[PDB]
């Protein structure tokens, strides 16, 4: 249940936002503000359910949409080689 980045992934906070770099492939990705917030809270050890609760309490988003959006982001992070399965 623990969200983990792949070992070769580095993170930077920049003026464009949060960036993830794959040190093997050289691919690097920009996360928008919501994606960065989700990833940061998952890396803190919070569950996706925790993060959904946070998003609904802080943003104009329904709980159902928050859960789907978190799940889609995590799936995309795994798809694109940033997060471990």
């Amino acid at each position: 249940a623990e969200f983990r980045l792949r070992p070769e992934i580095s993170v930077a906070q920049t003026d464009y936002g949060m960036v993830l770099l794959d040190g093997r492939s050289g691919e690097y990705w920009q996360l928008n503000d919501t994606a960065a917030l989700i990833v940061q809270r998952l890396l803190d050890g919070h569950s996706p359910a925790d993060v959904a609760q946070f998003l609904t309490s802080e943003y104009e988003v329904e709980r159902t949409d928050a859960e789907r959006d978190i799940a889609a982001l995590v799936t995309s992070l795994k798809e694109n080689g940033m997060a471990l399965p």
Binding site: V19, G26, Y28, L31, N32, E58, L73, S76
Partner: peptide, 18 residues
């Protein structure tokens, strides 16, 4: 509450040898 923008991930580029 804050305006919600759905999470987005964008590939910026690929670092290679020069």
């Amino acid at each position: 509450k804050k305006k919600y923008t759905a999470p987005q991930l964008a590939k910026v580029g690929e670092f290679k040898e020069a």
